[PDB]
Amino acid sequence: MLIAIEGVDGAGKRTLVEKLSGAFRAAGRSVATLAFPRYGQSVAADIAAEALHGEHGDLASSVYAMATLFALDRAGAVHTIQGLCRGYDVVILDRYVASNAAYSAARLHENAAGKAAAWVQRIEFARLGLPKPDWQVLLAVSRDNYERDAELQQRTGAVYAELAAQGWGGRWLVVGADVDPGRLAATLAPP
Amino acid sequence: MLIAIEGVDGAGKRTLVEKLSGAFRAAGRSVATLAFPRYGQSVAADIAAEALHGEHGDLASSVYAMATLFALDRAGAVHTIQGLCRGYDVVILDRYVASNAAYSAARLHENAAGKAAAWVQRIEFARLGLPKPDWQVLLAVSAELAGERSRAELQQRTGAVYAELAAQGWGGRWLVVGADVDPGRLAATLAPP
Numbered sequence: 001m002l003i004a005i006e007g008v009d010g011a012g013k014r015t016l017v018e019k020l021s022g023a024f025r026a027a028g029r030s031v032a033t034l035a036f037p038r039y040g041q042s043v044a045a046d047i048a049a050e051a052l053h054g055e056h057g058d059l060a061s062s063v064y065a066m067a068t069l070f071a072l073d074r075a076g077a078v079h080t081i082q083g084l085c086r087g088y089d090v091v092i093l094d095r096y097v098a099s100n101a102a103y104s105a106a107r108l109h110e111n112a113a114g115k116a117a118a119w120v121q122r123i124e125f126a127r128l129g130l131p132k133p134d135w136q137v138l139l140a141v142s143r144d145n146y147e148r149d150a151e152l153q154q155r156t157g158a159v160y161a162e163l164a165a166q167g168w169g170g171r172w173l174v175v176g177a178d179v180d181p182g183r184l185a186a187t188l189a190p191p
Numbered sequence: 192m193l194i195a196i197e198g199v200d201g202a203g204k205r206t207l208v209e210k211l212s213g214a215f216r217a218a219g220r221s222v223a224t225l226a227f228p229r230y231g232q233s234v235a236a237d238i239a240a241e242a243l244h245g246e247h248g249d250l251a252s253s254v255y256a257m258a259t260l261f262a263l264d265r266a267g268a269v270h271t272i273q274g275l276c277r278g279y280d281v282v283i284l285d286r287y288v289a290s291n292a293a294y295s296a297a298r299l300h301e302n303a304a305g306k307a308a309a310w311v312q313r314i315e316f317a318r319l320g321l322p323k324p325d326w327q328v329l330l331a332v333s334a335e336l337a338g339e340r341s342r343a344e345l346q347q348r349t350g351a352v353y354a355e356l357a358a359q360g361w362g363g364r365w366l367v368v369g370a371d372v373d374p375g376r377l378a379a380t381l382a383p384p
């Protein structure tokens with residue numbers, strides 16, 4: 001089972017990944033985790049992150065350029081994701097493809113029905129063959145240049161809610177910060 | 192020996208690569224060639240090509256984004272270049288890193304001493320470790336464009352940056368030649384008997 005944890009920067013996804021992995025292990029499942037972007041592990045991920053801190057000229061000013069770099073990072077991880085899915089009962093991704101749709105749409109002042117989210121679906125799932133997640137979990141809540149942009153994060157949160165409501169990329173579950181990890185594990189993979 | 196053929200669009204680099212390969216082979220050297228970008232052979236190059244046809248939203252409007260895609264294509268080709276260099280006496284590249292510096296600088300209305308050309312050198316050679324060429328051959332051509340008599344244009348600016356890159360020895364030794372260059376004499380200069 002492939003589970004993606006999604007939400008805006010500062011939502012607390014890493015903590016939820018840690019707590020959810022512990023709940024799955026308490027239920028007897030083997031778990032692997034993988035975080036995107038793969039900073040330190042791929043050139044595309046490193047350049048993209050650096051661009052959001054102001055490096056690399058005009059790169060960050062292009063929404064589709066940034067989205068393309070994050071997609072190329074994920075493309076280099078296809079074999080890794082497939083390997084983890086064959087070897088372990090549950091694979092939890094800290095951020096996945098929906099992050100690219102949410103931030104790209106929000107930067108362009110688009111909604112989940114706009115061109116950017118559809119472009120991400122086409123390039124990442126259809127063209128690059130990224131494994132489709134069984135669950136996308138939105139951690140809904142009330143430093144690089146995205147994180148400093150309060151309006152951007154607010155718009156991204158709204159796009160995320162729309163993506164979940166429209167079933168973008170697969171089945172979604174929406175949870176809050178107070179979600180109980182044990183019950184969530186039971187919902188995602190009933191005993 | 193690793194040789195990169197450089198020049199503006201329409202200069203005739205592919206023809207020069209073919210003629211130089213024949214001259215090296217007539218001189219007893221084995222030759223392999225590789226063209227950049229590797230259109231049709233790498234995801235990065237294919238997305239770049241699509242953006243050059245107007246696809247992918249605002250991707251092409253970022254000079255550094257396009258330069259990054261061409262660098263990522265080349266990064267994925269290091270194993271190939273190293274293999275060709277182990278297998279053949281001469282490896283000739285139809286465009287290489289200097290293309291990225293020239294077109295990036297020209298698009299930004301910069302010269303060879305500007306930020307884009309230094310950034311290309313920093314990322315492609317110093318950071319990604321791409322093989323540095325033994326020779327970069329600039330196929331220089333007339334900058335006159337009959338369509339631009341209304342007036343420099345992108346191609347004209349790129350040609351000027353190229354001339355500066357060659358004069359300053361950017362990335363290594365350069366040789367500047369014209370379309371009428373004799374392939375045998377050029378081969379003898381690049382790899383003396």
Ligand SMILES: CCC1NC2CC[C@@H](Cl)CN2C1C(=O)NCc1ccc(N2CCC(n3cc(C)c(=O)[nH]c3=O)CC2)cc1
Nearest residue numbers: 200201227228243258261262286287288290291294295346
């Ligand atoms: C042969 C086709 C043409 N002949 C002429 C003659 C005159 C003009 Cl004005 C325009 N021309 C043509 C033209 O513009 N065709 C359209 C055209 C032609 C070529 C390009 N690329 C040029 C190289 C460039 N590049 C390459 C590498 C390896 C790199 O690392 N970095 C980089 O940036 C990519 C774009 C784009 C559009």
